[PDB]
Ligand binder design. Structure first.
Ligand SMILES: [Mg+2]
Ligand SMILES: [Mg+2]
Ligand SMILES: [Mg+2]
Ligand SMILES: [Mg+2]
Ligand SMILES: [Mg+2]
Ligand SMILES: [Mg+2]
Ligand SMILES: [Mg+2]
Ligand SMILES: [Mg+2]
Ligand SMILES: [Mg+2]
Ligand SMILES: [Mg+2]
Ligand SMILES: [Mg+2]
Ligand SMILES: [Mg+2]
Ligand SMILES: [Mg+2]
Ligand SMILES: [Mg+2]
Ligand SMILES: [Mg+2]
Ligand SMILES: [Mg+2]
Ligand SMILES: [Mg+2]
Ligand SMILES: [Mg+2]
Ligand SMILES: [Mg+2]
Ligand SMILES: [Mg+2]
Ligand SMILES: [Mg+2]
Ligand SMILES: [Mg+2]
Ligand SMILES: [Mg+2]
Ligand SMILES: [Mg+2]
Ligand SMILES: [Mg+2]
Ligand SMILES: [Mg+2]
Ligand SMILES: [Mg+2]
Ligand SMILES: [Mg+2]
Ligand SMILES: [Mg+2]
Ligand SMILES: [Mg+2]
Ligand SMILES: [Mg+2]
Ligand SMILES: [Mg+2]
Ligand SMILES: [Mg+2]
Ligand SMILES: [Mg+2]
Ligand SMILES: [Mg+2]
Ligand SMILES: [Mg+2]
Ligand SMILES: [Mg+2]
Ligand SMILES: [Mg+2]
Ligand SMILES: [Mg+2]
Ligand SMILES: [Mg+2]
Ligand SMILES: [Mg+2]
Ligand SMILES: [Mg+2]
Ligand SMILES: [Mg+2]
Ligand SMILES: [Mg+2]
Ligand SMILES: [Mg+2]
Ligand SMILES: [Mg+2]
Ligand SMILES: [Mg+2]
Lengths: 260, 159, 188, 146, 131
RNA sequence: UAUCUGGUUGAUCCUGCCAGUAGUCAUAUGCUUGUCUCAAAGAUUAAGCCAUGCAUGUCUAAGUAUAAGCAAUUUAUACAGUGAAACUGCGAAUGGCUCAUUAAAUCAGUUAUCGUUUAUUUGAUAGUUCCUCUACAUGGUAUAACUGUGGUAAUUCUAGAGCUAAUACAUGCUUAAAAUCUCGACCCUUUGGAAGAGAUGUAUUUAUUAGAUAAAAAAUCAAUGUCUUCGGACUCUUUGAUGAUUCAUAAUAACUUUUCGAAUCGCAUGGCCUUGUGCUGGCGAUGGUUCAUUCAAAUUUCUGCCCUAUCAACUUUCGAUGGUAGGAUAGUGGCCUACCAUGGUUUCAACGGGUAACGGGGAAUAAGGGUUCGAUUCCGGAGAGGGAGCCUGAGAAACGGCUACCA
RNA sequence: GGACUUUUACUUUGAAAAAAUUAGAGUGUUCAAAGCAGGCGUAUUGCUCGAAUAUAUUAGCAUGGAAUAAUAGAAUAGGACG
RNA sequence: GCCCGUCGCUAGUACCGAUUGAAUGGCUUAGUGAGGCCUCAGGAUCUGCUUAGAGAAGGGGGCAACUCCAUCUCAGAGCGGA
RNA sequence: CUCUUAAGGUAGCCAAAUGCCUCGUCAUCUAAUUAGUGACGCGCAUGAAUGGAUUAACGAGAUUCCCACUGUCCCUAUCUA
């Protein structure tokens, strides 16, 4: 259609942002960035929709123009910046460090973290390749390309990055029994050990997943994010440890907790 | 109203497709050529005005032309452009040489002058300085990181 | 202009296809370069997304390769002598990929007769030190040696002039040379 | 229909950048690059100890095999170095809760490595537009009927 | 190019327009609940039809079926919190046989009658629509 | 939310249609019309024609200010606040509108790119540039605005004369150590050996080579590589990804109207001792080549479209199906050309016709199964009076862009 | 221990999937159509549940099943296994 | 009693029909052929490089002799660019 | 139903090479058509081997029109024997 689109009709936006239907015609539309626009979460939704620190859209800029927010240790100023999975977001003038990490429903949840931890990030290697002049490089899902990596790190392995200096510091392989986030799909939000990687030459491998409740489920390899050792996750986890509850089970928990 | 055009030949008006950087046409948007009329370069009786430029002066002054003389408006503004203008040397330092022009408010009179450009400054040399070092530092830091890894690589066989 | 769209084509079934949309630049084609032989003249053409192809209109001197000797020298290019697509390319000496051409031999002579010491089919120690060692590998094909008598070499174009802007190629050897040689006696 | 004497085309026929030095005396007269097509497709002996060229062959040629991998019966062996597959299937019309036999014709390129006659069930693999209608390459051939 | 502010209609009319039977029954409900027009009976008559269907469907599932349970209890639970479904007709079988007045009974208007306040469902109306 | 009733007879029972009845995001119209909320709307006929106004412009602390602007006061004798105008940069390829064309097209779900382009955002990435006495304390011309002499009824027309800028235009310096390779002055004849001369960034173009692998032991010809116990000996020997590659990446010989490798800007004013306006030095901006990313794009696999035989054979006109080679392309491909074959589709409906046909999400109708609708709030396609052509740019075959024909 | 249907149809269970619409849970918009809000309290600097779920019957992919229905194979043995 | 057809009146409908009937749209034979674009040319106007002579400089380092780099100005002889 | 004189023009066809009136009426072709064609028909005085109607092919036959062509004309000039 003659070139890149610049708008987004408020309706064609990602559902997981949870914006209302009426308000205006448009949703922010992620700028170009480190995350796919459908897999991202603009700073403006964060500050105003999830955080409620902003009212207007004007106030979001007014905030960002005050350099009040760092993404991964770099001040970010673009209203429609596409933050995403494992991102950190540091609100300094209020002592808050978060980390975008999924719900159990499928929505980017407000997960506060220590003034530590905001020091690093988990990053799933996407490709690992010989660059020019023989120098090797890996690429994490977040658009980082760190050269000179450990030759043991293959594809689908995750990797501990520092942050304030790039640099990989230790890493986790991809094999049986590792603790894994589910990054997208129907099971978007779940966590749990592997069990089996069903490989299919040609297309789409399948990963059978078991959790700390012995529920089994499968997704694709492009959807599995290794995050640690069974019962040992390298990031603090949101409430409910990515469990999934039958709506029956879900119903019970609300009303019983309710009252006193 | 139509203007002659350098080197069409012809003594009539013809329509031409005109492009950027060509007389009788100022493009309104990058790319816009416009099929506009233009008059021949050959002098005919159809002319309203004829622009002549004096090449050699004759025996008599022309009262309004030869006699009177009118000044340029702006002087040099670049560094060496002042230096070519005053027959100076590289070592001469402009600054105390630039044309100034008096401004008369109504009771207070002040002056003003350009801002010599390409001017060599304390600050500029600091920048080349920084860039240079930046280059060498990273070069060396790269050669350590390369060397470090090439060691990490050897150990991925020895052990 | 030209368009490389498959729309205008009849369908496999034979059916005529109605006009769906208008032509789009992102499927265009351009007019060919029928590169000749003459004083260097290349026009550049601004392709898609920046980029430059180079319409070479006239070419003398292209970079050629002797594959078996491991070197490459830049000869003259005499004319075209054959061409598998259309012989009219020969008649009008147009240079394209897979052309088949006669090229100068003197830079290739000059390399051979200083790398080896031998002349082609008719002091100093460190100079002669090498020579005697580089020998016993100094006998090349007789079909390639005899050519040097005419000071010209049968070569094939492996560049794409109207694109690259370069008329590079390699000197015909081995069984490849046998085949084209054969075609030449039965027409040329 | 029939396979040539190799150099039966106005241009010399060879795999690209597969050189054999005349300066070097050898056993075999000509170097012969072949490969593993993939997916557990075994490149046949015909692809290896043959002298045919065919730049569009899944072995000995410059074409990858990726995407669908379909099977149909052979239905037309008349074109040179490409054939016609029939693919019979069953369409389900919901309303009559029943089925109807439809079919499709897939033009597919067939390497000289395979001697394929009409009636042969054939496995083919999607492989980038070879020509106007052809997107598949005969990659395995199960027997006739005898 | 906004977002369609959605809507739906609350009533339905009878297929046979002139059943003097139904016409009689209707009027009784109009004066024994002080109603304005038929649409007020229609609305609920529609309302009721959607309930019994919802019920009807779940009753065709297996009992212990995840869906039946969540949304069978749910239905009953709502019908209880309102005064339509009695404290122990709390099954799906009873929501089917659930009649009309069962709803119309729980109107503010009828309720204002049902404890002093009004003495007349028509008094009750003109009282409510007047703050 | 599984219902029928009235009309053929003198009466009867059937066939069967007509008629009633109910709904319609279903339009019109007639009469009537008080309050709250919600708020569609020149689609249908004419993608018919359009007065007039508006609908696309854009400035940070950070590219260019000698306004004969404004405020001023600056410590300001280069500039220094604000700032019209103009150059530079970016955007105008988004939106918005409409449904005309379109029936294997579009579109839908589903694939492919080992078949390509990709401004931008994000992350990576540059010691090599001259030369067997070179500006790098910084090279060179030109132009706008502006001044002034002008033309014409007329327009976002512009001429000739005079000025002056840059992150505009055009040039062009620079930086460590080593290593590896060719040319080889010469010495001394053997195991023979060499001084110093050049070349070696990246990108381009062609050729060649490596990119190993399923498990072992010998013999040779060719050119030479370590050593030792000078007889002859060599071991612990080096290499990534994919299901799959002539892959990534590297090497050799060269090629080139030679791509790029900062002559840019804002804030900071510190620190060394020989004290020279010396040497060094911080936080950012704007650029820059390659790669990755991102927002995309272009093709693309599989299956799926309404009425029609009072359309049965169609396709190769002047490419129809395929092979080879080239040309063209961002790139595959009969996309185009040359040559060569005679192939390709069809009663499992090809081909042709119609459509008051943009595809889909979806809408109406509620026992079910179906019937009918979908110009129109979201996705996709297309078009801007009809056609064709092209400029600019990353992106357009663009129409609030241009060029031509037609109206 | 992985891979495993001669070659299919069928059927199960999943995966990759859009929102709005539909069905449908929560929530007193004063009711309702709606909306996706909201709720608790010291209301002098607070706390706090949500924003589910179902549906797609074509085709493709993954998978459990092998009844039904098709399909291949030893007859001049030019058969099978090692 | 029912009832068939010609024939006669009125109105409406479609059919046939001289007009080598007419109109609109799609696709097209042959002939003609704008335009921008690519190419062989053209060269109003501008211009980079080399080179002998002349005037005015400053030393690559000398008791007289010797010799670079940069700039700018008037006859020319060249080979190139826009 | 009748009269002359035996019958009383059927199938067809037409202002036809058969129609006075007549340059018939209507349509069509054209700027205009005593022409041509298609129709109409109480047809002075059409009509069935005194053959009627139809008709492909054929024609130095009579007739109308269209394209082409042209000194037939506007409007004449020049050349050869
Ligand atoms: Mg944005
Ligand atoms: Mg400057
Ligand atoms: Mg169209
Ligand atoms: Mg089915
Ligand atoms: Mg009766
Ligand atoms: Mg009816
Ligand atoms: Mg509308
Ligand atoms: Mg309209
Ligand atoms: Mg648009
Ligand atoms: Mg200049
Ligand atoms: Mg100049
Ligand atoms: Mg100039
Ligand atoms: Mg001027
Ligand atoms: Mg390897
Ligand atoms: Mg490669
Ligand atoms: Mg379809
Ligand atoms: Mg018909
Ligand atoms: Mg191509
Ligand atoms: Mg071909
Ligand atoms: Mg044929
Ligand atoms: Mg039809
Ligand atoms: Mg239409
Ligand atoms: Mg439709
Ligand atoms: Mg639609
Ligand atoms: Mg439809
Ligand atoms: Mg319409
Ligand atoms: Mg368009
Ligand atoms: Mg219009
Ligand atoms: Mg632009
Ligand atoms: Mg246009
Ligand atoms: Mg407009
Ligand atoms: Mg527009
Ligand atoms: Mg308190
Ligand atoms: Mg199965
Ligand atoms: Mg009337
Ligand atoms: Mg008588
Ligand atoms: Mg008779
Ligand atoms: Mg008779
Ligand atoms: Mg008559
Ligand atoms: Mg007559
Ligand atoms: Mg007549
Ligand atoms: Mg006449
Ligand atoms: Mg007779
Ligand atoms: Mg007779
Ligand atoms: Mg005749
Ligand atoms: Mg004549
Ligand atoms: Mg005459």
């Amino acid at each position: 259609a003659r070139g890149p689109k610049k708008h987004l009709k408020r309706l064609a936006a990602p559902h997981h942002w949870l914006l209302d239907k009426l308000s205006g015609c448009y949703a922010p539309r992620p700028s170009a960035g480190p995350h796919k626009l459908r897999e991202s979460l603009p700073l403006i939704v964060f500050l105003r929709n999830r955080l409620k620190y902003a009212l207007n859209g004007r106030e979001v800029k007014a905030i960002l123009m005050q350099r009040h927010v760092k993404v991964d240790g770099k001040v970010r100023t673009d209203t429609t910046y596409p933050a995403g999975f494992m991102d950190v977001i540091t609100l300094d003038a209020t002592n808050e460090n978060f980390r975008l990490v999924y719900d159990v429903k499928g929505r980017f949840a407000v997960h506060r973290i220590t003034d530590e931890e905001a020091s690093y990030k988990l990053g799933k290697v996407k490709k690992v390749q010989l660059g020019k002049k023989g120098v090797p490089y890996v690429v994490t899902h977040d658009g980082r390309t760190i050269r000179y990596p450990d030759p043991n790190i293959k594809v689908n392995d995750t990797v501990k990055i520092d942050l304030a200096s790039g640099k990989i510091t230790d890493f986790i392989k991809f094999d049986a029994g590792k603790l894994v986030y589910v990054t997208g799909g129907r099971n978007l939000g779940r966590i749990g050990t592997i069990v089996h990687k069903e490989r299919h030459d040609g297309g789409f491998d399948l990963v059978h997943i078991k959790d700390s409740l012995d529920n089994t489920f499968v997704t694709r390899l492009n959807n599995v994010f290794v995050i640690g050792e069974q019962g040992k996750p390298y990031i603090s986890l949101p409430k409910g440890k990515g469990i999934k509850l039958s709506i029956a089970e879900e119903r019970d928990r609300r009303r019983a907790q309710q009252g006193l | 109203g139509f203007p002659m055009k350098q080197g069409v030949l012809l003594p009539t008006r013809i329509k031409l497709l005109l492009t950027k950087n060509v007389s009788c046409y100022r493009p309104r948007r990058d790319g816009e050529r416009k099929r506009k009329s233009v008059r021949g370069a050959i002098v005919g009786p159809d002319l309203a005005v004829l622009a002549l430029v004096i090449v050699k002066k004759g025996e008599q002054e022309l009262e309004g032309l030869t006699d009177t003389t009118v000044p340029k408006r702006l002087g040099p503004k670049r560094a060496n452009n002042i230096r070519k203008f005053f027959g100076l040397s590289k070592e001469d330092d402009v600054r105390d040489f630039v044309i100034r022009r008096e401004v008369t408010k109504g009771e207070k009179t002040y002056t003003k002058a350009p801002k010599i450009q390409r001017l060599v400054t304390p600050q500029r040399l600091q920048r080349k300085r920084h860039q240079r070092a930046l280059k060498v530092r990273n070069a060396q830091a790269q050669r350590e990181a390369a060397a470090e890894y090439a060691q990490l690589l050897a150990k991925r066989l020895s052990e | 202009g030209i368009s490389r769209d498959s729309r205008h084509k009849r369908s496999a079934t034979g059916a005529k296809r109605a006009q769906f949309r208008k032509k789009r630049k992102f499927e265009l084609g351009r007019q060919p370069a029928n590169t000749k032989i003459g004083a260097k003249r290349i026009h550049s053409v601004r392709t898609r997304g920046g980029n430059k192809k180079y319409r070479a209109l006239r070419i003398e001197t292209g970079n050629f390769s002797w594959a078996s000797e491991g070197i490459s020298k830049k000869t003259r290019i005499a004319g075209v002598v054959y061409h598998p697509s259309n012989n009219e390319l020969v008649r009008t000496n147009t240079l394209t990929k897979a052309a088949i051409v006669q090229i100068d031999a003197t830079p290739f002579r000059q390399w051979f007769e200083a790398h080896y010491g031998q002349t082609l089919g008719k002091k100093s120690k460190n100079a002669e030190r090498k020579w005697a060692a580089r020998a016993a590998s100094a006998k090349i094909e007789s079909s390639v040696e005899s050519q040097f008598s005419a000071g010209r070499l049968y070569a094939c174009i492996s560049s794409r002039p109207g694109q690259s802007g370069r008329c590079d190629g390699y000197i015909l050897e081995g069984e490849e040379l046998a085949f084209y040689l054969r075609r030449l006696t039965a027409k040329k | 229909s029939t396979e040539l004497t190799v150099q039966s085309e106005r241009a010399f026929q060879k795999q690209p950048h597969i050189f054999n030095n005349p300066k070097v005396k050898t056993s075999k007269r000509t170097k012969r690059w072949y490969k593993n097509a993939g997916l557990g497709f075994k490149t046949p002996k015909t692809a290896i100890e043959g002298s045919y060229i065919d730049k569009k062959c899944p072995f000995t040629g410059l074409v990858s095999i990726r995407g669908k991998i379909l099977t149909g019966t052979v239905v037309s062996t008349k074109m040179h170095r490409t054939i016609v597959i029939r693919r019979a299937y069953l369409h389900y019309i919901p309303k009559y809760n029943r089925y109807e036999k439809r079919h499709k014709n897939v033009p597919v390129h067939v390497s000289p490595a395979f001697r394929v006659q009409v009636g042969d069930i054939v496995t083919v693999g999607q492989c980038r537009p070879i020509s106007k209608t052809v997107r598949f390459n005969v990659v395995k051939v199960s027997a006739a009927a005898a | 190019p906004r977002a369609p502010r959605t809507y739906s209609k609350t009533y339905s009319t009878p297929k046979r327009p002139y059943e003097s039977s139904r016409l009689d029954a209707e009027l009784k409900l109009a004066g024994e609940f002080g109603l304005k027009n038929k649409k007020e009976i229609y609305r609920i008559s529609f309302q009721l039809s959607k309930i019994r269907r919802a019920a009807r469907d779940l009753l065709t599932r297996d009992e212990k079926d995840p869906k039946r349970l969540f949304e069978g209890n749910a239905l009953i639970r709502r019908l209880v919190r309102v005064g339509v479904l009695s404290e122990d007709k709390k099954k799906l079988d009873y929501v089917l046989a659930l009649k009309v007045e069962d709803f119309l009974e729980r109107r503010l208007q009828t309720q204002v009658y049902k404890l002093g306040l009004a003495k007349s469902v028509h008094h009750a109306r003109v009282l409510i629509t007047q703050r």
